[PDB]
């Protein structure tokens, strides 16, 4: 059957939600407004996102669909999945609103700014890499992995949400075609380092500064990597720099578990053809207490062909309605 909905005004809008969701209290805005709610069916605290202006234009409509499609695909312990999706619309003609329901998450990893033991750093990073092994196995690159994108409960069980530039890979930061899923492995590098030391690894002021800080730690590109650069003016720029050598990570990460340091040298690599993958990082000696290769699962492959399509508003909208309708909860 259809649920019983109830209406009520908050965030200057009249929210219409199933009666199972109780006690809606706003928790932010700017895409759509979220409310914290109590789900009476499951006993869970949940976030209900009402999308704003979901079909106002073609870009709104396509993005509306891209969000719903993605969330529907993610079925993993360490990745934010979709608990429910609804509209008060009773047919496609009157379909103009969309609500997304996800697990209400406690802190993010910024909140865990204030220092972590090695065992706990292992546990947090291992969960990110497990989540990332899944995500990447479906051909999805997160692209903006950072502490504010990583939610943890009380027990520090970690989920990745949301698929600053302090954690962005330098090839993603610089518009370099030469990239890979391991752009996310760079972000994990910067995150693990900060968990280890208590400070941001590369707190640049602009993109130049950032790059300068990066190259100071990892070294200026060496001939092998220079050969992978097709722009001459890019190549000239790079070799016009004052040449920096690769610093020893042991002397940046003082007293850190030596396996953590070794691992950080494998992530914080400028050439992404050489950067360690999530799958490989899970097998690093450093996660010995948490690694189990028959419980680090992969994804069904994710169809993104829709991204190349030039469709009308109404067709992105019907396409979204189909995804709403066919949704089966966990």
From Swiss-Prot:
Keyword Transmembrane helix: no
A single BP term in Gene Ontology: 3'-UTR-mediated mRNA stabilization
Cofactors named for this entry: Mg(2+)
Subcellular location: Cytoplasm; Nucleus
Keyword Nucleus: yes
Modification Phosphotyrosine occurs at: 302
Catalytic residues (positions): 162 (proton acceptor)
PTM description: Dual phosphorylation can also be mediated by TAB1-mediated autophosphorylation. TCR engagement in T-cells also leads to Tyr-302 phosphorylation by ZAP70. Dephosphorylated and inactivated by DUPS1, DUSP10 and DUSP16. PPM1D also mediates dephosphorylation and inactivation of MAPK14.
Main location: cytoplasm
Recorded catalytic activity of this chain's protein: L-seryl-[protein] + ATP = O-phospho-L-seryl-[protein] + ADP + H(+); L-threonyl-[protein] + ATP = O-phospho-L-threonyl-[protein] + ADP + H(+)
Similarity comment: Belongs to the protein kinase superfamily. CMGC Ser/Thr protein kinase family. MAP kinase subfamily.
PANTHER family: MITOGEN-ACTIVATED PROTEIN KINASE (PTHR24055)
Protein name as it appears in the record: Mitogen-activated protein kinase 14
Native species: Homo sapiens (Human)
């Amino acid at each position: 059957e259809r649920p019983t909905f109830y209406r009520q005004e908050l965030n200057k809008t009249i929210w219409e939600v199933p009666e199972r969701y109780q006690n809606l209290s706003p928790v932010g805005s700017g895409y759509g407004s979220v409310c914290a709610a109590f789900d009476t069916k499951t006993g869970l605290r949940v976030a209900v996102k009402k999308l704003s202006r979901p079909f106002q234009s073609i870009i709104h409509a396509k993005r509306t669909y891209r969000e719903l499609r993605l969330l529907k695909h993610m079925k993993h312990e360490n990745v934010i999945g979709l608990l429910d999706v609804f509209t008060p619309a009773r047919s496609l003609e009157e379909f103009n609103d969309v609500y997304l329901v996800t697990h209400l998450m406690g802190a993010d990893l910024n909140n865990i700014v204030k220092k972590l033991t090695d065992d706990h750093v292992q546990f947090l990073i291992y969960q990110i890499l497990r989540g990332l092994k899944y995500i990447h196995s479906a051909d999805i690159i997160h692209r903006d992995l950072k502490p504010s994108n990583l939610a943890v409960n009380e027990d520090c069980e970690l989920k990745i949400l949301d698929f600053t530039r302090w954690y962005r890979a330098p090839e993603i930061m610089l518009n370099w075609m030469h990239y890979n899923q391991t752009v996310d492995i760079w972000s994990v590098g910067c995150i693990m380092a900060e968990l280890l030391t208590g400070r941001t690894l590369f707190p640049g002021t602009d993109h130049i500064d950032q790059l300068k800080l990066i190259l100071r730690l990892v070294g200026t590109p060496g001939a092998e990597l220079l050969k992978k650069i097709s722009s001459e003016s890019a190549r000239n720029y790079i070799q016009s720099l004052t040449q920096m050598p690769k610093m020893n990570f042991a002397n940046v990460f003082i007293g850190a578990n030596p396996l953590a340091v070794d691992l950080l040298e494998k992530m914080l690599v400028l050439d992404s053809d050489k950067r360690i993958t999530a799958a490989q990082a899970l097998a690093h000696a450093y996660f010995a207490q948490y690694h189990d290769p028959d419980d680090e699962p992969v994804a069904d492959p994710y169809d993104q062909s829709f991204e190349s399509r030039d469709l009308l508003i109404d067709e992105w909208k019907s396409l979204t309605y189909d995804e709403v309708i066919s949704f089966v909860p966990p």
